[PDB]
Amino acid sequence: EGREDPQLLVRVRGGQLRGIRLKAPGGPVSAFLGIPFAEPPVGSRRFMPPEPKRPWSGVLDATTFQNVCYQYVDTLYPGFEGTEMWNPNRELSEDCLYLNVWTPYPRPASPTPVLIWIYGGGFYSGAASLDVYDGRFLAQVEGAVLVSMNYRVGTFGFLALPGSREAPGNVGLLDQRLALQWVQENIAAFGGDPMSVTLFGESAGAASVGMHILSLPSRSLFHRAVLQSGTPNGPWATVSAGEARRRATLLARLVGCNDTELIACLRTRPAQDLVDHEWHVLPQESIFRFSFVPVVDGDFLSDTPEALINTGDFQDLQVLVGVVKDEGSYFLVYGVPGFSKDNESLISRAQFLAGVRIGVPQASDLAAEAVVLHYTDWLHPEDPTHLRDAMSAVVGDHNVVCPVAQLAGRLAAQGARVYAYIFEHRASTLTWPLWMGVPHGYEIEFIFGLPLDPSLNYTTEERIFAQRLMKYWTNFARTGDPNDPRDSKSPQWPPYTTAAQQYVSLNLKPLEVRRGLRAQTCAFWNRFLPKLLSA
Amino acid sequence: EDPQLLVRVRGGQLRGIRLKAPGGPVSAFLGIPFAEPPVGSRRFMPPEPKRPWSGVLDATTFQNVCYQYVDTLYPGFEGTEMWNPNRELSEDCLYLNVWTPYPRPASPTPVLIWIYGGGFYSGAASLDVYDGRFLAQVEGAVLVSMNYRVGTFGFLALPGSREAPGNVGLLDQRLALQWVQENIAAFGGDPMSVTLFGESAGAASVGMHILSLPSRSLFHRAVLQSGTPNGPWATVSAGEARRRATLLARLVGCNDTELIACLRTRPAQDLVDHEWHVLPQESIFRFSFVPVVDGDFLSDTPEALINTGDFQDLQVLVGVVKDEGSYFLVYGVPGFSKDNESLISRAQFLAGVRIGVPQASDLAAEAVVLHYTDWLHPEDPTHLRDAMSAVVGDHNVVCPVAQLAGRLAAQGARVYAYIFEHRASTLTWPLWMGVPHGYEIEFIFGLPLDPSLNYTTEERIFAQRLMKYWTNFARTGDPNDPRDSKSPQWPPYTTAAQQYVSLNLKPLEVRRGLRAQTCAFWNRFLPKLLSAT
Ligand SMILES: CCN(CC)CCNS(=O)(=O)Cc1ccc(C)cc1
Ligand SMILES: CCN(CC)CCNS(=O)(=O)Cc1ccc(C)cc1
Ligand SMILES: *[C@@H]1O[C@H](CO)[C@@H](O)[C@H](O)[C@H]1NC(C)=O
Ligand SMILES: *[C@@H]1O[C@H](CO)[C@@H](O)[C@H](O)[C@H]1NC(C)=O
Numbered sequence A: 001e002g003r004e005d006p007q008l009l010v011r012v013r014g015g016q017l018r019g020i021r022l023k024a025p026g027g028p029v030s031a032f033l034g035i036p037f038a039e040p041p042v043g044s045r046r047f048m049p050p051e052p053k054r055p056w057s058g059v060l061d062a063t064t065f066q067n068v069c070y071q072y073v074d075t076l077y078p079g080f081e082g083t084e085m086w087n088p089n090r091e092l093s094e095d096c097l098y099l100n101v102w103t104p105y106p107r108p109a110s111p112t113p114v115l116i117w118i119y120g121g122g123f124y125s126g127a128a129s130l131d132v133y134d135g136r137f138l139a140q141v142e143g144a145v146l147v148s149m150n151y152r153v154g155t156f157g158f159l160a161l162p163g164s165r166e167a168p169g170n171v172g173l174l175d176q177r178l179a180l181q182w183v184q185e186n187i188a189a190f191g192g193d194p195m196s197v198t199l200f201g202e203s204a205g206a207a208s209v210g211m212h213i214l215s216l217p218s219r220s221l222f223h224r225a226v227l228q229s230g231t232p233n234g235p236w237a238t239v240s241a242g243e244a245r246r247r248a249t250l251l252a253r254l255v256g257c258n259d260t261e262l263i264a265c266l267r268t269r270p271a272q273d274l275v276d277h278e279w280h281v282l283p284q285e286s287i288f289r290f291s292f293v294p295v296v297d298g299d300f301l302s303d304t305p306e307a308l309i310n311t312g313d314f315q316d317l318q319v320l321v322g323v324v325k326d327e328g329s330y331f332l333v334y335g336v337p338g339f340s341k342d343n344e345s346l347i348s349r350a351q352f353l354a355g356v357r358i359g360v361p362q363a364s365d366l367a368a369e370a371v372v373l374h375y376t377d378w379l380h381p382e383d384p385t386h387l388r389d390a391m392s393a394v395v396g397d398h399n400v401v402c403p404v405a406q407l408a409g410r411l412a413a414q415g416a417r418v419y420a421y422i423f424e425h426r427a428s429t430l431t432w433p434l435w436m437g438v439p440h441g442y443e444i445e446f447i448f449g450l451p452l453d454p455s456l457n458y459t460t461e462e463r464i465f466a467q468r469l470m471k472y473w474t475n476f477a478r479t480g481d482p483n484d485p486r487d488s489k490s491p492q493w494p495p496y497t498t499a500a501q502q503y504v505s506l507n508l509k510p511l512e513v514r515r516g517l518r519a520q521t522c523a524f525w526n527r528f529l530p531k532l533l534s535a
Numbered sequence B: 001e002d003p004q005l006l007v008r009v010r011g012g013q014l015r016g017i018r019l020k021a022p023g024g025p026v027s028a029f030l031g032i033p034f035a036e037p038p039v040g041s042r043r044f045m046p047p048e049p050k051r052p053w054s055g056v057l058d059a060t061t062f063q064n065v066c067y068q069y070v071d072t073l074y075p076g077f078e079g080t081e082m083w084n085p086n087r088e089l090s091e092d093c094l095y096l097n098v099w100t101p102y103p104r105p106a107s108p109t110p111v112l113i114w115i116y117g118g119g120f121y122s123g124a125a126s127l128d129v130y131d132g133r134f135l136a137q138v139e140g141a142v143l144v145s146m147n148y149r150v151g152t153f154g155f156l157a158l159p160g161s162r163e164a165p166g167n168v169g170l171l172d173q174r175l176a177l178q179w180v181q182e183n184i185a186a187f188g189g190d191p192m193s194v195t196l197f198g199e200s201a202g203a204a205s206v207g208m209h210i211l212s213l214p215s216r217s218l219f220h221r222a223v224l225q226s227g228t229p230n231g232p233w234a235t236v237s238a239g240e241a242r243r244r245a246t247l248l249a250r251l252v253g254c255n256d257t258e259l260i261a262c263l264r265t266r267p268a269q270d271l272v273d274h275e276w277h278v279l280p281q282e283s284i285f286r287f288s289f290v291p292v293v294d295g296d297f298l299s300d301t302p303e304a305l306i307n308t309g310d311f312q313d314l315q316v317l318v319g320v321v322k323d324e325g326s327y328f329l330v331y332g333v334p335g336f337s338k339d340n341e342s343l344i345s346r347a348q349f350l351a352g353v354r355i356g357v358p359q360a361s362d363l364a365a366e367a368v369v370l371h372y373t374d375w376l377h378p379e380d381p382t383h384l385r386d387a388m389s390a391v392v393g394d395h396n397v398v399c400p401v402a403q404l405a406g407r408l409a410a411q412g413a414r415v416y417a418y419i420f421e422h423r424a425s426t427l428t429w430p431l432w433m434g435v436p437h438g439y440e441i442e443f444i445f446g447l448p449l450d451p452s453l454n455y456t457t458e459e460r461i462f463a464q465r466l467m468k469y470w471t472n473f474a475r476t477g478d479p480n481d482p483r484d485s486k487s488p489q490w491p492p493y494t495t496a497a498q499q500y501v502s503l504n505l506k507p508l509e510v511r512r513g514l515r516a517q518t519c520a521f522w523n524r525f526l527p528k529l530l531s532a533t
């Protein structure tokens, strides 16, 4: 050093870092990218719990994003920004345990509340380096210290032979946990406040956040949580020990492989071979189901999330949860016959019934009948536009809306301060067709403030709307309350309660308070369907 | 001797009476025997045609009411007593009544035949609410009503036995229908234009005449008010009728021939005393002795018959009142009473569901609770109370009606549907019960035309409107008034559009979907659930 920028030199537990001064529309921000927090989980370390990164010598260059965790890459619509925006934007490697810090420039002199982002992607994909997760805007406009980590996905992160020493399960969640510990120890060096840490995440990221709430060793590592369109409870976010074991051994067979021997053989397989067979282990033809996800191990998760949220005391927990208007639409083009992004996807009654079997793969013929009958419009039972929309609702309700409603209800009944929202604005920049509405994932670019980038062609009102959302999120992180104190003009966001069930609509219009989060329909999914399946 | 009041029928001569209606005189011929008295060894037996008589038979007064249970829940209370027998009880009760214009119609006049309800355990054609004088005076109708045996006397069955075949109360109805065919022209009636109408069990009877071949030659059109042959209460299987008949016999100290012989020695009231004790569950909207699927009068279950039926040349008017279930709640469901607002707890709602849906398994009862609960206010006692009423109304009447209408329309029938939503200003039941089961009848029969009953002028005009709909339907198969252009028109019910109309003080409003979502639950989902327990 000596001729470098003295404002970008920082020491952490493992050694010295040099970050980079980024340009944001409002001014500069500090970025420290590709900071290693674990020893590379490769070779004999594949499927193993991560170990803390061993100290390095000299100045680690922290000016670029590091490798993305080895993962399936989406092929359905090549070159289409709608899918490609979620695809890896750095080299795929098993050496991928790195994290990223964004702060104001110069760095804050007083301890600043920290936001930690956990990406989604069904636990089979994702990366902290995607453009939609750019932390520079929150850092610049709101003064946030923002952290995001890579964690192992797919087999690498979640293949488990429960009870074994060599593949104990949930190691991708342990990657996340190790990053949270890194923040506690080191974030003060960047001006961050380890006594004020808020997790947020979307989809599998949301489910991860929920699991950290439900896992005791994680509870000492953060203070507040935001769950966007995902939950630990529900049909996709976990598997039993038996089911993880069965999937792990099937995959082993499919790539040509006593747990020790089975795992030793798997560890000799090229990463890509595992990826190429990952989807073949699902027990049924299905959408919104992922082969390798957290396992109920009786360790990280001491019981099912269902049982844990039913018996947990969440007195000192503040939580923000919500959904987008059309959670299920995105998933339909990946498996339900009759659906495509390139046409209006009007479907027949027969295609609806078939689509229900795929969207609710665990349903008996009778439960499937219950779903079809509940979602049918009996005034227009053959109308193809309603059927298409009902198929979307089936998938979004089963997988996201009702699990969320269930989570908010249990958390609120048991001490938590809960705030709930529905996100209803469709980006003017959206490349998916109109019938898909506001699809899964499409609130993220607003929370992170992408509309502030002039090159992205968002409207003026969308720019203002993004600033509103950044305020809610950052005020929640700061105070546990999305409302602003210096502002009694704007309508207030009341907490979700069991008695009144209030949530707010997020759109271009000022906040509107609504009541009941699909109450009738979620009673069907959350109270009735389980009884029917268990008989 | 007024010759307008003297009629010769096949059995002999009758003398009727000239009554006063507010607008003019009418000719009434009351208590005409259409069958040999079903007494002694004829108890439980099919009716036989009345034998001829000498001289002039006095037909100026109502005959005895068929032996039946008499309600005692609210002694002296107008709301219940209005359904109670208003003449002496007797097993000698097979008589009919005819009202016509005075003087007797100059040309063959369309006939309306009323079949009273009362759950097949009660009822009488002599009730004030079934007074045919208004329809005859104002619309010029020829109106006919008959007594038919009810309870054990009409429906106790040992299926396959010669001495208690079942369905004899239905056979009483049919014999009266034959009597109309053979005799009504002497009163100025047109035997080639006969419309049946009936409410509750009467509506269900009408439906059974539709589904029974020998009846089909005796009428041309049908009106079913708040009742259907299909559904959970109107019929029993042969096994279950046999079970009930033998249990009742056992209860009164009684091989089929021997068993029925002993039952025939028992005084009528002894049978009535134990009538209710044979129901398999504590329940409401369930009756002990009802039509039986015998493979004779009913060749299969009504549901099977409506599904396969060809109903091309049939015209049918069907409908329900706004609060079908409320009347039944006070007869067994804890928490309910006419003398308070009947606000109930959640536990009372679950308990009430088991009583109102007595055949439901735990899971099926659970499904009913979750469907009807308002999950925004799961413990609001006002909603729970109104939900309880809706469960009973939907299960027993509304959804069976919607099912019947849909099957009939799909299979060629001309169908008109209504919901009756007007609560009479004179109603003596409390407000929470809304428009209860049975409370459209007094309007259809034109009772608000009686100045001494104190209906509002609006209600008087409303009554005349309904009398027009009903008699226009009888005349033409279409309730719309030809002298009236756009009113708007009452459209036929179809499976596609599902149109029905609201009957109230406001002009007709056309609606689509008769509890469509909820009836899918009852009509499509629940049976599958139970057929898997
Ligand atoms: C939009 C949000 N996510 C990331 C958070 C993007 C994509 N992943 S997804 O799980 O949402 C849908 C999906 C499912 C199955 C396959 C094969 C492909 C895509
Ligand atoms: C309201 C109309 N009906 C006649 C058409 C009057 C009563 N009969 S009912 O079946 O409607 C209700 C009922 C049921 C069971 C008991 C013991 C008492 C009353
Ligand atoms: C939409 O596209 C899919 C896939 O090409 C196809 O199966 C479906 O038939 C299409 N719908 C229509 C009506 O064009
Ligand atoms: C928006 O700006 C212009 C169109 O006016 C175009 O050149 C550019 O590609 C657009 N930006 C994006 C990313 O859509």
Ligand SMILES: *[C@@H]1O[C@H](CO)[C@@H](O)[C@H](O)[C@H]1NC(C)=O
Residues within 6 Å of the ligand: B334, B335, B336, B337, B339, B340, B341, B342, B343
């Ligand atoms: C209404 O009356 C019945 C019987 O008289 C009683 O059981 C019920 O508790 C009453 N409802 C009230 C006042 O809550």
